[PDB]
Structures are given as structure tokens and as C-alpha cells.
Design an enzyme around this catalytic site. Structure first.
Site, PDB file in Angstrom:
ATOM      1  N   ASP A   1     -17.445 -41.911 -27.297  1.00  0.00           N
ATOM      2  CA  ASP A   1     -17.811 -43.241 -27.767  1.00  0.00           C
ATOM      3  C   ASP A   1     -18.670 -43.113 -29.019  1.00  0.00           C
ATOM      4  OD1 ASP A   1     -18.630 -45.796 -28.223  1.00  0.00           O
ATOM      5  OD2 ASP A   1     -19.307 -46.205 -26.250  1.00  0.00           O
TER       6      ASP A   1
ATOM      7  N   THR B   1     -17.682 -50.555 -32.098  1.00  0.00           N
ATOM      8  CA  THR B   1     -18.501 -49.644 -32.893  1.00  0.00           C
ATOM      9  C   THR B   1     -17.677 -48.988 -33.997  1.00  0.00           C
ATOM     10  OG1 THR B   1     -19.934 -49.176 -30.988  1.00  0.00           O
ATOM     11  CG2 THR B   1     -20.021 -47.642 -32.845  1.00  0.00           C
ATOM     12  N   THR B   2     -16.690 -48.175 -33.612  1.00  0.00           N
ATOM     13  CA  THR B   2     -15.957 -47.387 -34.597  1.00  0.00           C
ATOM     14  C   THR B   2     -14.973 -48.241 -35.386  1.00  0.00           C
ATOM     15  OG1 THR B   2     -14.208 -46.752 -33.035  1.00  0.00           O
ATOM     16  CG2 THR B   2     -16.166 -45.350 -33.134  1.00  0.00           C
TER      17      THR B   2
ATOM     18  N   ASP C   1     -19.028 -51.258 -20.930  1.00  0.00           N
ATOM     19  CA  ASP C   1     -18.006 -51.820 -21.805  1.00  0.00           C
ATOM     20  C   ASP C   1     -16.971 -52.612 -21.014  1.00  0.00           C
ATOM     21  OD1 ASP C   1     -19.380 -50.564 -23.801  1.00  0.00           O
ATOM     22  OD2 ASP C   1     -17.909 -48.967 -24.120  1.00  0.00           O
TER      23      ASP C   1
END
Lengths: 510, 504, 497
Positions: free
Chosen positions: A43, A76-77, A375
Site C-alpha cells: 500500500d 493514494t497511488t 480500506d
């Protein structure tokens, strides 16, 4: 202007890390802790949190990425990869001679299109049935679990999420507070020992197993009264003769009885204290057959106060029946070989705080499940917040890049330089998904773009997880509208933040 | 390549300018040239300074090569090429750093030339305003102030000019040019310097062979026969040659190799003017002045005589007037002679040899100033008037070349700037005042609204003021200044087009 | 040493200019400043930028000091001081190398600033009601300040709050402390909450809920500082009750005051809410003295560290005090306080830096309206005033002969560094805009200047892009002095050790 090359190349240093973690088939990275502990994570949220880069422009990229974690939690990414693409395309546009302010203005005008193109594919879940909402909600939750050891028990962990959030939301208000859900897990047991518990587990042994580890409902009395006390079970020495010590030791029991009489008179069934119990404090409580718990922190004590509508009672004589917390029952539950001797406090119904019991063979396994639970719960909370969803993973990024390109054909101006690159940048997501999945890096892009136009407009995505076709509805790959909006929205904020930095002035300490 | 070779190119041409910078001006400072042999030479001659200049950097071979063509092609303008060009390149590098493409810089400099040539062609002057007013007297005074006669140059220069004012010739199909070897001037001890006399006509360097012969024959229209072969005894035949002078009708006789005693007396009895032993070069000019043709030997198919109506010239009036120890033959006019004469008076011939030094230079310089028809107001007027006019030209284009129009125009101040630095006078005061005097000349003067609004004020390097260079008399050819600017931009473009240098 | 000490000093000030040159304009760039506290600030605010430069070169210390004075004396134009002051020194490089002395240069710069201030006076237009209504005087100006921003679509949202934010102040007393901004993460831009007065985010770090009714129609606000929380063998308890009874009576001494709202600078816990829950007194500790002094300026109370010496004179009352769940967090608000001349805005948005962009976009718009009420004389914006002074000083150099002619000409050339950086930082064609602007200005129009909407020149009065006259005057006078300070240095003597 050459500093723009330094700033963009700096972002590539960040991207060359995060790129490889994208995908359910992602590549994990080693985290070496300052103390030397090894953590393995897929993650980028945990990668960026621990990643220490001396490049100040990279420090900005991390601080800005925190904003997607604080809101949606799972993107996030997405904003990292999109930003590296926006900056990579900018590097070429800078070489073409476009002033940075015109690059940024164009990225905004093209972005305002892609946002509206995404809207063409939204659909609602809850419009049908509560059972079908639970069905589609469950079908979506399983999409988040495939990267964790739960890949075997993903049904057992997914069946948790349905009621885990539904129990703590408000159907009419449609606003659920994540702080109502706790993840309580320990390193040990097995992942099949993870449970969804209606309430809180304190992991406390009532100070001694001879002390009543449970209170029966009392033929359905007013629950079990829980005394939250902030002090040890003891009162908050020159022996010149024998008579004196006879009281010195007893005086503890005088306060033990005073505290017990405060328990019995107040109606407190279980005495939960911040500090420990004395050996004779347990004895005096054993004389009165009154349960009690010791060494409990306020986080645990509030979960009592929360689910039981209780009070943090500051002292033993400050007990009041109206201030005592009322739970349906309390009991000490051991799981298998668990020697911690945990206790469970429940309303026997939708509690104002629920706890997911997590066990795992290795510390990594536990954190992997708990991080997925964070998540996976966010998947639910985002689907509850905004029912508008897309079968979009891998398809919307292509659909959006197709629309932006079609717009470039209608620009006829300096904007053709930017709109063409905005689509080329959006394509870095399905490209990265392909490379990280072991598929053809170029042929994936052509196959995806062809099927969404040559066949017809539909939801056609990547084959990362492995599946015979590109159909996102058959895999049920679902993302929230608000999520994809924040990804593309914050990406343009990331680009503006970087392109608008002309000098990095680093001062020293005198 | 890139800004590196552009920076190197400028530094090279500025180093070349550091050599010629100090040499600009009649009062400049000289440079010492040293070879490996061990010899040294010191000169202000711009062509020599550049010819012996050793240039190692390849950019300077272009700048010098142009100036080499400038001297071989024109004969002057060698200093202005380097100074003008080096300022153009110094300012061009600033345009490069200001994001001006080299092509745009070149394009605008060429447009400025198209405008500047028109301006220079409009503001120039012709070979006029030189009579009755001290334009050639102050030009002559400039050459004569360095002579020992300097104190009396007001009296001598009047003759230098007044004589040259009458010797207009057609040369090659009406060039309108003055003869260099003319105005036969006599160095004489007669009287004081300021009393030297100007003669209305030519004086052949000779007198009447015998004081007995008549000295003025045919006042209205006179024929002159120039002979070489002597009339002396080798005697009735060489005397009879006078009877052939009589029958052939030569009124003034120029006998080069001498006259017999009987021939001298026969001229008296014949009332014919006899002359002996004249300078051959003057006799050839007499052949072109009156037409008297020197006969070196008498052949013409056995003809022996002055050759009636053949070898005789034509003149208006021939007089020998006595001016106090000056008894020589004067030639008034004729169809075409373009001749004159000056009497020099002074201490003695050794002191009049200063007039030999003075007239050799003064006649040459004044003739050179009248050699060119169109002339330029000197002293930075052609540079500074462009500065003002080219500023207003900035409004004609006003797009991207507007920046180059300014830098081209401002570069033209390097000349009045350098003229001041080399003169020791305050360079910032003189240049600024030159701009303000030419600035107002572009306002109301061309509107014909003028009380005293008149340009052609230029830099005076001696008195240290800005003066009307017409009444002060500093002029330069229009072919020089126009060719100078044309040459300057040729090298400026050439250097600005160098963006790569590969060393193999 | 010698004339070359000036060359070195100019080179240093040029370095400052090159760092500060990208910062001019609402469309301009940011500088990433890493402080010695590892506190990284990315800002286009020249007041913040100049504060944190940490310049060490002796000559640049002078340049920065002059610009920091612009902030205290005027408050706006600190960027224009650094750019104008630096270019006036950059244009002096060719003059020093030609032998022009420091007196000759400085005397000319003093001549120019005299010529310019008078032409600024002529350009000044007194805008009170002159061709402007009272509402659109402020409204159209604030709408201009916010045009073509990320808040463009919410322009009506922010202008409605922005114009009345300053208009809600005392029109006789303008002060930045009376418009405060909270960085409230969570919510969209249009979700930002305007507080008629002052609000704070309840830093109370403990529990105690379901007690102490927290909302008051007529509260009595009391400010404390001290902590009133507490945290033979039987005799061991006495020492705990000895202290407990002391602070517990002090908690009663608060009740004896009669406070409905109790503030503290130190953490207040549940043990203190023991009494405050029993007597039902809202208490919020860890509160900034700025908001507490705003309470003093809102309701007119007084801060007493201890509980015993408090009299009713320490209490004050507001029109509404309410704790709200708005903002995914509890916030306490004061509105309509009898003495309050202040207001605050809680900025909500997608991120802290998204808020920062709205924050500083608003902070400037606040100053735009602030000086609309402060200043009566206005001058043209968009560099039109810089072109106005350029044309006039060019004309003076035509009528003035001597060394002053060249020096004055340099002054005019440097006046165009302001429109130049306005052009370059906006991405426009600087060559084209500078030329079209110069010629059009020379045709007689004094209001033509930089149009950010379409790359063009136009009337900044019609665009309501107005700058204060004293901003232009005091900055120009300050820049002339700065050039007198740097150009006048002949030697640097450093006592080392």
C-alpha cells in the site's frame, strides 16, 4: 526555466518507487524501520508515510497525497501516478516552449471535461433493495480483499463488512462515522479466528479468574452496571506497638469495604479501574462476589461509556447509578489458546462502537488484514456516502482519455498541445496497471481503446487479477464517483503545486 | 555553440576595438606595434594599425578583412568600421539575452539601413556654401594652424581658396574637379607676409628674354608659339626662324633653348614678345592653358618654322607687370586654361619654404574637400542626427524590430563618445549636449519654424565646445559615411550569423 | 575596494531581484522556503518571502530591510519595492563603468523621484462616490480580485462573504486582526462558514459529553489560566482530598463568579468537569489569547489566571454562543457581541493547500477592499501608472540637458520592469505587450494597462483594477532611498572573529 527540469525529474524519483506498487498483482516493498524492523507492504499509503526523501519537492508530493488518505482513503497511488504523468507530459511541453502558466491553465480546461465525461457512466446501488444493496455492497467489498491473505477467507471477511458499517450508520441521514468502528487485533491465532464483534473487546481478565468473569443479565435487569474508575483499588508507617499494625494492614480493607460499599450501594456490577487491584482488594471483592476489571486505558473505558451510555467516574465514592454504564452483558472470552483472557462488552445489538476481532499468524498478516479492513470499510463508507458508482476500474481512465483526445480534435489552437498530453497522461494508469500485471504494456492500451469505441461505449478494463475477458461487470470492479473525481481533481492540484514552484530556497540553522 | 560562442565572439571583437578605440581623432593616442624580429612602429594610421594587427581568434579575421576591403576599395573609413561594429555586437548580445532571435536582430538592422540611407541622403550637403563665407577658409585654417605661418593664415588662406575657386575643370567628361598641380605660386622675398598678392591669372615661370622686347602683344586676342630648338648660332637661318615667327604670326614666342642676339633684337624690330628658357612642365601646362605647343624638333615633312596657324595657341591677354622685384609673364584668360598665380612675400625663401610646406598640404586638403560633391556635416552630426531620427523611426515598425532599431541607433553614439574620450574632454557632457542640439533640430526646423533652429552643430575637439560645423568647417564625404554604415552592418550581420564553431 | 565595491554590491542586489522577480502578480509563482525549524512554507506573499529569506550579504540586508519597512508603513507593494529598487540598480551598471560618480547617479535619482511624485499626484483620482456607487465601489473591486481563479465558479459565494466581511468591520478602524481565517479541513469551498464574530475549534482534549449545556443565548464568559483538574494507611487519602478540596472550592469560586463559559490556556480534563458538570458550566481550555482578547474586544471581559479574585467585572456576554457539529468537528462561535468589531471565516475545502490557495486569494481580496475604504486617492493599476511615470520622465529628459539626461533616461527604462514582470509571470509575449502598451499610452490614454483576461492592454479604471496612491508614492520614495543606500557604499569593513 531549467529548474522545471530539476523539479520534474525529482517527481520521477518518487514515481519510480510508487509506480510498481499499483495493482492487485502489485509488487511489495521493504520498509526498514528506524529501529531495524522489517515491514512488507503493497500500500503506497504506508510507503509514502515512512518514505524519507531529502528532495523538498518530493516532500510536497507526500504532504499533498495525505489529503486523499484523510478523505477517501484508497486513492493514494492514484494521485501519485497521475501527477508523475502530468509532470512528465509537462517536461515535453516545456521543451516545446509553452510557458508553465499556459500548461496549467490547459490542464484545468481539459480536466473540467473529463470530470463531466465520468458522469455519463454513473449508476446507483441503493435504488433497488436493502438486500440488493447488501448484495452489491458485498460484491464490491470483495474487490478490496484480493491483495491480502484473506484471499482464501475473503468471503468470511467480506461478510463482516456488510453489517460492520450498516450497524453504525444512519439510514435516513446516510452519514456513518468511522470512529464508531474499531479494529482490535493481536499477533497470533489464525486469520480464521478473526470475528466481527457487536461491541468492544478490552483484552482484560477481571484482575483474577476467581473474580466473576461475567455478569448474567439478572433475569433481564437494567443491563450490567459498569463502573469506570480512574484510580487503583486502594486508598488514594511507624509501628510502636502491636495494636497499631493490626489496623495498618486492615485500613486497606476499610477502604476496600468503603469502595465495595460504594459499589454495592451505587449498584455497580463490574468495577473497571485505571490501575491495578491489591491482593486483598481482590480478596475483599471475592468476599462480596463482585466482578471487577483493572488496568484499563481510557480508550477502552470510553468504548464502555460509548456503547453503554456510561460515565468515566473519577473516584470510587463518586459512583452514581445514573452514571454507571449499562451493557446487555459482559463475559471473558478466550479464543483457542489465547492466554490474554479477553472480555467482551456488548449491547447485544447495534452498538455505538463495534470492534472487528482480528487474529493472524504473523505480525505482517495481522496488519495486512487490519489495513484491508480500514480500506474495505472505506469502500463501504464511500459507497454509502455517494451511491453513484462506476464499473470503472481501468475503464474510466481509458474512457476519459478517449474523450479528452476527441476534444483536442476540436480545439484548433495552443490548447491542442495540452489536451493531447492530458489524454496521454491519463493513459499512464491503464499502462501501469498492465506493466504491473505482467501484460503487454502497449497492446493493453490499444486493446482497451478499441473495445470502448470500435465495439461500443462500455466498461472494458484490465486483466490484472486474471480473468478470461475485460468485462468489469463480470468481475464487478467498482469505484466511487467521488473517488475518481478526487483522484483527477487532486491530480490537477498536484500539477499546479509543482509547476508553480520556481525556486527552492533551503535555509540552514545558525 | 549557443550562447557560449556568442559570448566568445563579442569578447574577440571588443578586444579588436580596444586597439583602435584610442586612435579615433586628430588628437588621439598612438599604438605601439611589436614583432618577433624586435622592431617597433608607432602610428595612428588606422589602415596600418589593422594591417599589422595579429588576430588569433577567428571572429576578428572577418572584422579586419572587411576593413582591409574598406581601405583597398575606398581608401578611408578603416577606424569607423571596427568601432561602429564592436558597439553593434556589444549591444546585440544584450538582445540575445532578452530573447530576441538572431534572425530578427539582423532583419531589423537591415531595415534601419534602408531608413538611414534615406536620412543621410536627405541631411547631407553639396559642394556649395564655400564662396564668400569661411567654409574653405576654416578648412584651410585647419590645415594651416599647424604651420609656422599660422598667425597669418587669415591672409594666406584667402589666396589658397580664392585661387582654387577659379580652377574648376571638367576633367573626365565634366567631373567638376580642381587641378592639383596649378596656381603657379612664386616664393619671393618681396615684402611682409600679410602683403602677399593674389594674381588674377597665370604666371609662366620666366620673363621677357631681353628687356628690350615688347612685353604685351595682342591684348585682345593673342597667339603663342612655343619652340624648343634654339635660335642661337650653330646664324641668318636661326634668325630667319624669327622671320618665320613673323610670317606665321606668333605674337608671344616661348623659345625654350635660347635666343640669339640678332633674334632678340629682331623681335624688338618685329614688335613680337620673346621669351627664353621656360620650365618644361609649365610649358606642357601652357600647351593645355593657352595651347602653345612645344616643338622639340622641326620636321613636319621638311617644315622649319612656328608652323603658321598650326602649333600656335590662343590666349586673351598676355601682360608682364612689375610688382617690385617680380617681372614675369601673366596670362589673363582664354577658351580653356583654368590657371592662376600667387605672389608670396615674406622674410626669405627659406621662410617661404614654409609656404612650400603649407601650400603642398593646404592646396591638397582643400582640393580633397572639394573633390567630393556631396559632403557630410562632421563631428558626430551624421552619427548623432541618426540617433535622434532613428528614435522616431521606432514608431514606423513598432513590433519586434523596435528593440533592435533602438540598439542600432544607440550604437551610433560610440563615435561621438569615442571622439570625446580620445580628446580628454568630458565624454558624458559632450555626447549628451550633442544629442540635445540635434534633438530640437528634428522638431520645428523641418516645419520651417525656426528662430535659431538649425542643425549641423558638431563636436569641436580643440576649443572644447559644440559648434556649427558648417561655419567651423568640418566635412566628410557622403560616399565615406554611407559606405561606412553599409560596411559596418556587413560585419555585424556576419558575426551575428556565427552560432557554431567546430574545431577539427 | 573602490568603484568595484559598488559593482559587487549591485551584483548582490541583482541576486535578490532574480529570486523575487517571479513573485509579482496574482498569476505569479511561489517560492519553497525551508526554515531552520524544518517548517516548510510555500508562498507568493512577499512579506512572508522577505521575512524568511535569511540574507547574509551586507548589501542585501539593506535591500531587504527597506522592503520590510514597506510592509509596516504601508502593508502592500513589498514586491514592487524589491523589483523596482533592484532594476534601478541594475540599470546603473553601464553608468558606473563609464565613470559616472555616485553623487551624479544619486542626484539624478533624487531628481527623478521628485518629478515622478508630482505626476503621480496628477494621475490621482479621488474615488469616494466619484462615478461609483457605495456597494459596487467595494463589490466590483472584490469581484475583480477573484476573477479567473479556482474560486471563479464560487465568486458569488466568496464575494458575498468577502465584501461584507470588511464592510462588517468598523469603517473608521481597519485592522487585519479583525478578519481572521481558520484552516478547516473537510468540506467543499462553498461549504466555508462565515462567523459574524470569532470562533475557535474547541481544543478541549478530554471527554465529558452529555453534561454541561454548551449553548447560551446570553453567556457570561470567564477566562482562567490555571488547571482546576485534580490529576495510618487510610490516612494516605487525605493528601489527595486536601488538594482536591482546594481546587474544588476554586471550581466553586468560578461558580461564585457566575460564568457560563470558562476558558483556559492550560488543558482542562474531566476531573475539572466534575464540578462544572455538577453546576453546568461550559469550559474550554487551551484557547489562544488572540481569540480570548477578541472576547475582551467582543464582550468586554478580563482574563484572571486564578479563581478567587474574580468579580463580575471579569464577565462578558455575547448575543449568541453556539457549539456546532458543522465541519466534521465541534466549533464554538461568538456572534453579535456588543463590543465586537471583528469577524472570522472558517475556510473549508479539499485540502490544507487548497484552503491556502483560497486563503491567500482571499487575504489579497480582503486587502483590496480594506484599502478601498482606507484610501481616497487611487492610481491606475496593471502597470499603467508605471507607464504614466515612464512617459512623463521621458519627456523631462527631452527638455533637460546635461548628465541628468542619460540618468533620467535610465530611470524611465527601469520603470518598465514592473509591466515587464507582470507580462512574463502571466505568460504573455513581453515584447509585444511592452510595445503595444508604450505606443498606445503615448497616444494619450493614461489608463491602458495589462489585461489578464485576454492578452491585451485596456482601461484598468473600467476593469476596476485600482491601487492606492500612497502605495505607489511611498514605495517609489522608498526605492529611491534604497538605491541611494546601495549605490553610496564605497567600502565594506568587517570586524571578524
Amino acid at each position: 526555466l531549467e529548474a522545471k527540469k530539476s523539479h520534474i525529474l525529482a517527481a520521477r524519483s518518487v514515481a519510480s518507487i510508487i509506480k510498481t506498487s499499483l495493482g492487485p498483482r502489485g509488487l511489495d516493498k521493504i520498509l526498514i524501520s528506524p529501529d531495524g524492523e522489517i515491514t512488507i507492504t503493497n500500500d503506497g499509503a504506508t510507503i509514502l508515510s515512512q518514505m524519507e526523501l531529502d528532495n523538498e519537492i518530493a516532500k510536497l508530493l507526500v504532504q499533498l497525497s495525505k489529503s486523499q488518505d484523510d478523505e477517501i482513503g484508497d486513492g493514494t497511488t492514484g494521485v501519485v501516478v497521475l501527477a508523475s504523468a502530468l509532470l512528465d507530459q509537462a517536461l515535453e511541453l516545456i521543451q516545446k516552449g509553452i510557458h508553465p502558466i499556459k500548461i496549467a491553465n490547459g490542464f484545468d480546461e481539459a480536466a473540467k471535461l473529463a470530470i463531466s465525461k465520468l458522469e455519463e457512466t454513473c449508476d446507483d446501488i441503493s435504488a433497488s433493495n436493502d438486500e440488493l444493496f447488501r448484495d452489491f455492497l458485498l460484491r464490491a467489498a470483495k474487490t478490496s480483499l484480493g491483495s491480502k491473505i484473506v484471499s482464501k477467507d475473503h468471503d468470511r471477511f467480506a461478510e463482516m463488512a456488510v453489517e460492520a458499517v450498516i450497524n453504525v450508520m444512519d439510514k435516513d441521514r446516510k452519514d456513518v462515522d468511522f470512529d464508531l468502528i474499531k479494529m482490535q487485533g493481536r499477533v497470533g491465532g489464525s486469520i480464521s479466528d478473526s470475528k466481527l464483534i457487536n461491541g468492544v473487546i478490552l483484552d482484560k481478565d477481571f484482575s483474577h479468574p476467581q473474580m466473576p468473569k461475567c455478569v448474567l443479565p439478572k433475569e433481564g435487569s437494567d443491563g450490567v452496571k459498569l463502573a469506570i474508575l480512574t484510580c487503583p483499588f486502594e486508598p488514594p508507617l511507624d509501628i510502636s506497638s502491636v495494636e497499631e499494625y493490626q489496623k495498618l494492614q486492615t485500613y486497606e480493607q476499610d477502604k476496600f469495604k468503603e469502595m465495595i460499599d460504594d459499589v454495592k450501594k451505587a449498584g455497580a456490577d463490574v468495577v473497571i479501574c485505571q490501575w491495578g487491584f491489591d491482593d486483598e482488594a481482590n480478596h475483599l471483592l471475592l468476599q462480596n462476589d463482585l466482578p471487577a476489571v483493572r488496568w484499563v486505558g481510557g480508550q477502552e473505558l470510553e468504548h464502555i461509556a460509548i456503547s453503554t451510555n456510561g460515565r468515566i467516574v473519577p473516584r470510587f465514592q463518586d459512583l452514581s447509578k445514573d452514571k454507571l454504564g449499562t451493557c446487555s452483558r459482559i463475559y471473558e472470552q478466550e479464543f483457542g489458546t489465547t492466554k490474554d483472557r479477553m472480555l467482551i462488552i456488548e449491547q447485544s445489538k447495534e452498538t455505538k462502537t463495534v470492534t472487528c476481532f482480528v487474529r493472524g499468524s504473523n505480525k505482517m498478516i495481522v496488519d495486512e488484514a487490519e489495513r484491508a479492513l480500514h480500506d474495505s470499510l472505506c469502500v463501504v463508507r464511500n459507497l454509502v456516502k455517494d451511491s453513484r458508482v462506476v464499473y470503472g476500474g481501468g475503464a474510466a481512465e481509458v474512457t476519459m482519455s478517449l474523450a479528452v483526445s476527441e476534444e483536442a480534435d476540436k480545439q484548433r489552437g495552443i490548447d491542442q498541445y495540452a489536451f493531447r498530453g492530458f489524454a496521454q497522461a491519463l493513459d499512464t494508469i491503464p499502462m501501469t496497471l498492465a506493466e504491473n500485471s505482467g501484460l503487454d504494456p502497449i497492446g493493453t492500451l490499444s486493446t482497451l481503446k478499441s473495445k470502448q469505441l470500435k465495439e461500443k461505449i462500455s466498461n472494458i478494463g484490465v486483466d490484472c487479477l486474471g480473468y478470461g475477458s475485460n468485462d468489469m461487470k463480470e468481475l464487478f470492479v467498482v469505484d466511487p464517483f467521488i473517488g475518481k473525481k478526487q483522484q483527477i481533481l487532486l491530480a490537477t492540484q498536484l500539477c499546479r503545486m509543482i509547476l508553480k514552484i520556481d525556486n527552492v530556497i533551503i535555509s540552514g540553522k545558525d | 555553440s549557443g550562447d557560449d560562442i556568442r559570448n566568445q565572439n563579442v569578447l574577440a571583437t571588443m578586444a579588436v576595438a580596444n586597439v583602435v578605440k584610442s586612435s579615433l581623432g586628430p588628437v588621439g593616442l598612438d599604438k605601439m606595434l611589436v614583432d618577433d624580429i624586435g622592431d617597433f612602429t608607432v602610428t595612428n594610421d588606422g589602415a596600418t594599425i589593422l594591417s599589422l594587427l595579429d588576430v588569433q581568434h577567428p571572429a576578428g579575421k572577418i572584422l579586419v578583412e572587411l576593413a582591409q576591403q574598406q581601405d583597398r576599395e575606398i581608401g578611408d573609413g578603416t577606424t569607423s568600421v571596427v568601432i561602429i561594429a564592436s558597439e553593434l555586437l556589444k549591444r546585440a548580445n544584450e538582445l540575445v539575452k532578452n530573447k530576441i532571435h538572431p534572425t530578427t536582430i539582423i532583419t531589423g538592422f537591415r531595415v534601419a539601413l534602408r531608413e538611414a540611407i534615406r536620412f543621410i541622403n536627405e541631411v547631407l550637403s553639396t559642394s556649395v556654401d564655400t564662396l564668400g563665407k569661411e567654409t574653405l577658409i576654416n578648412i584651410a585654417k585647419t590645415s594651416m594652424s599647424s604651420k609656422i605661418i599660422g598667425a597669418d593664415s587669415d591672409f594666406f588662406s584667402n589666396m589658397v581658396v580664392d585661387a582654387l575657386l577659379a580652377v574648376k575643370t571638367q576633367n573626365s567628361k565634366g567631373e567638376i574637379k580642381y587641378p592639383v598641380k596649378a596656381v603657379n605660386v612664386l616664393k619671393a622675398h618681396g615684402k611682409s607676409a600679410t602683403e602677399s598678392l593674389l594674381v588674377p591669372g597665370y604666371a609662366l615661370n620666366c620673363t621677357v628674354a631681353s628687356q628690350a622686347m615688347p612685353k604685351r602683344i595682342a591684348g585682345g586676342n593673342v597667339k603663342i608659339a612655343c619652340l624648343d630648338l634654339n635660335l642661337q648660332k650653330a646664324a641668318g637661318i636661326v634668325l630667319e626662324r624669327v622671320k618665320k615667327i613673323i610670317d606665321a604670326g606668333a605674337q608671344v614666342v616661348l623659345t625654350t633653348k635660347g635666343i640669339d642676339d640678332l633674334c632678340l633684337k629682331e623681335f624688338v624690330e618685329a614688335k613680337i614678345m620673346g621669351v627664353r628658357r621656360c620650365k618644361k612642365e609649365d610649358l606642357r601646362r601652357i600647351a593645355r592653358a593657352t595651347g602653345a605647343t612645344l616643338v622639340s624638333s622641326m620636321s613636319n615633312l621638311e617644315g622649319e618654322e612656328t608652323f603658321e596657324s598650326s602649333y600656335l595657341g590662343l590666349c586673351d591677354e598676355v601682360v608682364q607687370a612689375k610688382f617690385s622685384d617680380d617681372e614675369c609673364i601673366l596670362i589673363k584668360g582664354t577658351s580653356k586654361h583654368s590657371s592662376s598665380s600667387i605672389i608670396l612675400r615674406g622674410a626669405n625663401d627659406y621662410s617661404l619654404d614654409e609656404m612650400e610646406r603649407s601650400l603642398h598640404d593646404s592646396l591638397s586638403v582643400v582640393k580633397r574637400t572639394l573633390e567630393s560633391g556631396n559632403v557630410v556635416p562632421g563631428g558626430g552630426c551624421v552619427e548623432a542626427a541618426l540617433n535622434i531620427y532613428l528614435d522616431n523611426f521606432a514608431t514606423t515598425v513598432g513590433s519586434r524590430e523596435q528593440l533592435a532599431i533602438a540598439e542600432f541607433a544607440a550604437a551610433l553614439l560610440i563615435i561621438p563618445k569615442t571622439l570625446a574620450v580620445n580628446a580628454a574632454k568630458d565624454s558624458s557632457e559632450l555626447v549628451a549636449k550633442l544629442r540635445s542640439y540635434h534633438a530640437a533640430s528634428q522638431m520645428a526646423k523641418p516645419e520651417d519654424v525656426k528662430r535659431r533652429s538649425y542643425r549641423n552643430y558638431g563636436l569641436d575637439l580643440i576649443r572644447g565646445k559644440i559648434v556649427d560645423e558648417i561655419h567651423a568647417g568640418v566635412l566628410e564625404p557622403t560616399i565615406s559615411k554611407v559606405k561606412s554604415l553599409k560596411s559596418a552592418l556587413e560585419a555585424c550581420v556576419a558575426i551575428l550569423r556565427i552560432d557554431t564553431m567546430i574545431t577539427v | 575596494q573602490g568603484k568595484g565595491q559598488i559593482i559587487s554590491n549591485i551584483n548582490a542586489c541583482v541576486a535578490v531581484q532574480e529570486a523575487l522577480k517571479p513573485t509579482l502578480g496574482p498569476l505569479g509563482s511561489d517560492i519553497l522556503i525551508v526554515t531552520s525549524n524544518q517548517k516548510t512554507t510555500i508562498s507568493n506573499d512577499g512579506a512572508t518571502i522577505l521575512k524568511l529569506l535569511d540574507v547574509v550579504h551586507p548589501a542585501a540586508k539593506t535591500l531587504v530591510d527597506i522592503s520590510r519597512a514597506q510592509d509596516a508603513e504601508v502593508g502592500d507593494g513589498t514586491t514592487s519595492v524589491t523589483i523596482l529598487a533592484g532594476e534601478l540598480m541594475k540599470e546603473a551598471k553601464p553608468f558606473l563603468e563609464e565613470g559616472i560618480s555616485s553623487h551624479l547617479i544619486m542626484k539624478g535619482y533624487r531628481k527623478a523621484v521628485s518629478l515622478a511624485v508630482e505626476k503621480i499626484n496628477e494621475l490621482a483620482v479621488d474615488i469616494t462616490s466619484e462615478k461609483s456607487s457605495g456597494r459596487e465601489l467595494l463589490e466590483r473591486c472584490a469581484r475583480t480580485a477573484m476573477s479567473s481563479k479556482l474560486i471563479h465558479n464560487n465568486a458569488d459565494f466568496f464575494v458575498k462573504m468577502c465584501v461584507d466581511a470588511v464592510l462588517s468591520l468598523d469603517r473608521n478602524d481597519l485592522d487585519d486582526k479583525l478578519i481572521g481565517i481558520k484552516k478547516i479541513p473537510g468540506g467543499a469551498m462553498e461549504e466555508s462558514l462565515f462567523i459574524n464574530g470569532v470562533a475557535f475549534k474547541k481544543t478541549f482534549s478530554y471527554a465529558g459529553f452529555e453534561q454541561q449545556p454548551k449553548k447560551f443565548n446570553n453567556p457570561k464568559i470567564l477566562s482562567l489560566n490555571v488547571e482546576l483538574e485534580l490529576k495510618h494507611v487510610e490516612d494516605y487519602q487525605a493528601i489527595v482530598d486536601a488538594e482536591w478540596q482546594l481546587i474544588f472550592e476554586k471550581l466553586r469560586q468560578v461558580e461564585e463568579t457566575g460564568a457560563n463559559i470558562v476558558l483556559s490556556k492550560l488543558p482542562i480534563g474531566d476531573l475539572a468537569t466534575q464540578f462544572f458538570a455538577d453546576r453546568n458550566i461550559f469550559c474550554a481550555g487551551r484557547v489562544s489569547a488572540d481569540d480570548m482578547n477578541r472576547v475582551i474586544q467582543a464582550v468586554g471581559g478580563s482574563i484572571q489566571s486564578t479563581t478567587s479574585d474574580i468579580k463580575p467585572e471579569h464577565l462578558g456576554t455575547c448575543a449568541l454562543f453556539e457549539e456546532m457539529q458543522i465541519g466534521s468537528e465541534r466549533y464554538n462561535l461568538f456572534q453579535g457581541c456588543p463590543q465586537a468589531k471583528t469577524c472570522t471565516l472558517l475556510l473549508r475545502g479539499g485540502a490544507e493547500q487548497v484552503i491556502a490557495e483560497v486563503e491567500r486569494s482571499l487575504h489579497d481580496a480582503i486587502m483590496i477592499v480594506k484599502r478601498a475604504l482606507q484610501n481616497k486617492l487611487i492610481v491606475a493599476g496593471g502597470g499603467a501608472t508605471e507607464m504614466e511615470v515612464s512617459k512623463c520622465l521621458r519627456d523631462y529628459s527631452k527638455t533637460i540637458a546635461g548628465k541628468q539626461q542619460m540618468i533620467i533616461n535610465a530611470f524611465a527604462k527601469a520603470l518598465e520592469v514592473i509591466p515587464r514582470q507582470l507580462c512574463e509571470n502571466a505568460g504573455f509575449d513581453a515584447i509585444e505587450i511592452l510595445n503595444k502598451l508604450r505606443l498606445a499610452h503615448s497616444k494619450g490614454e493614461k489608463w491602458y494597462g495589462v489585461v489578464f483576461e485576454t492578452e491585451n492592454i485596456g482601461d484598468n479604471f473600467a476593469k476596476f483594477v485600482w491601487e492606492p496612491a500612497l502605495v505607489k508614492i511611498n514605495a517609489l520614495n522608498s526605492a529611491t532611498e534604497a538605491t541611494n543606500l546601495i549605490l553610496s557604499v564605497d567600502e565594506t569593513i568587517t570586524n571578524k572573529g
